[PDB]
Symmetry: C3
Subunit: 258 residues, 3 copies
C-alpha cells in the first residue's frame, strides 16, 4: 500500500518528502515541493514553482499553483508558498504571484480555506485564518492572523483584512478592514468588533472595552480618520491590542497634501 | 462496457444495486449504499457513511458525503441520507452531519440541486425543491417541500426555508423564510408570495387570495408576530394552505418573557 | 509529451483537428468538434452537439456542452458554439441552448471566461469580454464585445450587457446594462461609464466626452427613456461610439401601448 497512487502523475522535476501521499488522478507538476506528512487527495492539480509545507490537506478538484488568468501576467516564473497545517478544501483555486508586485502568493500556517474559495495572485494570508466557501481574494490581498471571512466574502484587489477581523456572509470588501472590526454586506460597512474572537484569544476585559471605545472613536464619534488616529494615541499607548487596532488604521491611510 | 466503469474505484464495504451505473475516475467510498437505477457520472467522489436512494443522477466533480470542515466536527461517524429521484448537478458539495444536531444530513425525494451548490452539515431538505447554482446552506438548514432558491442564495445556520417559498438570486438569508413568502437581496427582505407555485400546485382560486390576505397581516399591517398569529388563527383553521403558512411563523418564533 | 493523452476518452463521432491536445482523464463526447490548435486540459468533460473553434484553452474541471438543468429543456438535440482564441478557466460550466430560443448557446472569439463561471442556455457572447470568477448568466443573456463582468456578477435571464460596459463585483443584474455603463450593487444600479475601457480602445477625447454627455441625458437629467433616446439622436448620428450607446438603450425598451 504506497503513499503515491499508480493513477496519479508526479513530475521527476517535483520534490515530495516522506509521508507525502498523492491520491489517484492527481497531477504533481514541475518545480512543486511538498513537505513532510502532507496529504494530497484525488483529482488535485498542483503546478509550480510552488512550495507546499508540512501536514497540509489538499482536497479533490483544487487547482493549486496555477498561472493567473490576469492579462497582467505575461508568463513569468513567479512563486507560491504554503505553510504548515493548512486545510485547502474542495475546488479551491490558489494562483501564483505576478512580477508586478513581488512575484509571490503566500499562505502561512494553520489556515482553513473552505470549498471553491479563491486565493488570487500576490495575496498574503497569515496564520489561523478561516476562509469560508467561495471567499474570493482578487489579488494583492493581505489577510492578517485569525481573520474570519464568512461565506462568499469577496475582496477587491490590494485590500488589507486586519487581524481578528470578521466579514459577514456575502460581503463585498473594497477598503482595508481594520483589526478586530466586523464588516457586513455589499458594500461592506463596519458593524462592530469581534469581541468573541478577543475572548477566544484570552483578552482582558479592560482591553476588550478599550477596543469597544476604540471603535466608537474611529466610527460612532463623528471623528475623521486623521483625528480618530490622534485620539486613539493614548488608549493605544496603554493597550497593545488598541495599538494593533490603531496601526491597522494608520497603515490604511496615507492621503495627499492640501 | 459494464455499468460500473473499470476506471472507477469501489470500496468492498460499499453496496450498490445491480443496475447502478458508475462513470470513469469516480470513487465509491466505504459504507456508501446506492439504490436501484442511480446514475453516478465521471469524476464524482462519494464518502461514507452515506445512503443514496433510487433513480438519482449525480454529475461530475461533485464531492457528496465529505466531512464538514467545521471545527465543531472532530471526525465523529455521522451520516448522509439522500432520497429517490434527485438531480445533484456538477460540482455540488454535500457534507455529512455533526453530533451536535442529530448526526445526519438529510435530502428528500425529487429535488434539483444545481451546479457548485452547497448542502452543509445537518441540513434537512424536503421534496421537489429547486436549489439553483452555487446556493449555499451553511449548516443545520431546513428546506421544506417545493421551495425555490435562486442562484448564489446564501442561507445561515439553523434557518428554516418554508414550503413553496421563493428566494431571489444573490439572497443572503439570516432569519426564517415562512412558507410561500418570496424574499430578496442581501440581507433578504420579504416582498410578496410565490403565486406561480400556488398556480402550479393547483391551489384553489379562494386559497391563493386567503394567502395573499395572510401575508398582509404578517407584513403590510403593522402587527407584531404574536398579533399576526392571532389574526391568522381564523384563516389557518379555514384553509390547510394558510395553516402551512401560520405554522411556519409559529415555529419560527418563541422569544423571551417581559 | 503526446498530443491526446492515453487516459482521455475521445468519442468516435467527435472530430478533432490534427494538432488538438486532450489531457489525461478528459472526455470528448459524441458530436464535439475541435478546431486547429485548441487545447483541452486534464479532467475536462465536453458534451455535444458542440463546435469548438481554433486556438482555444479549456482548463481542468470544466463541463462544456452539458444539457441545462432547466425543466423547460426536454432532451432536445440543441447546440453550443465556441469561437477562436478563447480562454475557459478552471471549473467553468457552459450549457447548450433550448429549442425555445434559437436552440444554441454561443461564445464568439477572444473571450476570457474565468474560474467557476457559468454560461446558461441560449446565452450569446461577443468578443474580447472578460467574465471574472463565478459570473453567472442565468440564460438567454447577451454579452457584447469588450464587456467586463467582475467577480461573482449574477445576470437574470434574457438580459443584455452592452459593448464596453462593466459590472462591479457581486452585481445582481436584472434589467439590461446599456453599452459603456458601469453598474453596481444587488440590485445593480448605473454609476458612470467605462472611461478606462474607452482609452484602451483608443477612443477620441471628442468622443469620450460625447459619451459622458450621453450617460448624463439618460440617467443624470430627469428624461423618460422615450425623451432620452430622442435627445441622443443628434449625438448618435455624429459619433458611432454614441450610436452604439443609443442602440443598446433603443433595443432594451419596447414597451406596451397606453
Ligand atoms: N469552522 C468554522 C466556521 C466559523 C465561522 C464561519 C462563519 N459563518 C458562520 C458559521 N459558523 N459555522 C458555520 N458552518 O458557519 C459563515 O460564514 C456562515 S455562511 C456559510 C458557512 C459555511 C458554508 C457556507 C456558507 Cl455560505 C464559518 C465556518
Ligand atoms: N428549472 C428551473 C429554475 C427555476 C427558477 C430559477 C430561479 N431563477 C430564475 C430562473 N428561472 N429559470 C431560470 N433559468 O432562471 C434564478 O435563479 C435566476 S439566477 C440563475 C439561474 C440558473 C443558473 C444560474 C443562476 Cl445565477 C432557476 C431555475
Ligand atoms: N484580466 C482581467 C480582469 C480585468 C478586470 C477585472 C475586474 N476586477 C478588478 C481586477 N482587475 N484585476 C483583477 N484581478 O481584478 C474585479 O472583478 C475584481 S473582483 C475579482 C477579481 C479576480 C478574481 C476574482 C474576483 Cl472576485 C478582473 C480581471
Amino acid at each position: 500500500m504506497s503513499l503515491i497512487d499508480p493513477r496519479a502523475i508526479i513530475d521527476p522535476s517535483a520534490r515530495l518528502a516522506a509521508d507525502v501521499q498523492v491520491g489517484p488522478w492527481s497531477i504533481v507538476g514541475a518545480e512543486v515541493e511538498i513537505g513532510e506528512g502532507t496529504v494530497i487527495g484525488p483529482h488535485v492539480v498542483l503546478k509550480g514553482p510552488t512550495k507546499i509545507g508540512k501536514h497540509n490537506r489538499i482536497y479533490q478538484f483544487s487547482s493549486v499553483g496555477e498561472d493567473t488568468p490576469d492579462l497582467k501576467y505575461k508568463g513569468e516564473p513567479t512563486r507560491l508558498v504554503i505553510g504548515d497545517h493548512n486545510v485547502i478544501r474542495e475546488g479551491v483555486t490558489i494562483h501564483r504571484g505576478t512580477v508586478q508586485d513581488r512575484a509571490e502568493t503566500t499562505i502561512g500556517d494553520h489556515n482553513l480555506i473552505m470549498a471553491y474559495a479563491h486565493i488570487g495572485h500576490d495575496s498574503v494570508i497569515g496564520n489561523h485564518c478561516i476562509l469560508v466557501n467561495n471567499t474570493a481574494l482578487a489579488g494583492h490581498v493581505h489577510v492578517d492572523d485569525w481573520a474570519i471571512l464568512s461565506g462568499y466574502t469577496l475582496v477587491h484587489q490590494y485590500c488589507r483584512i486586519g487581524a481578528h477581523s470578521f466579514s459577514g456572509m456575502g460581503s463585498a470588501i473594497g477598503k482595508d478592514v481594520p483589526a478586530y472590526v466586523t464588516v457586513f454586506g455589499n458594500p461592506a460597512e463596519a458593524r462592530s468588533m469581534n469581541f468573541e474572537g478577543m475572548r477566544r484569544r484570552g483578552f482582558s476585559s479592560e482591553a476588550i472595552h478599550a477596543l469597544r471605545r476604540a471603535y466608537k472613536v474611529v466610527y460612532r464619534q463623528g471623528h475623521t480618520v486623521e483625528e480618530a488616529l490622534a485620539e486613539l494615541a493614548e488608549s493605544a499607548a496603554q493597550f497593545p491590542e488598541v495599538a494593533v487596532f490603531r496601526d491597522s488604521i494608520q497603515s490604511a491611510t496615507r492621503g495627499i497634501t492640501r
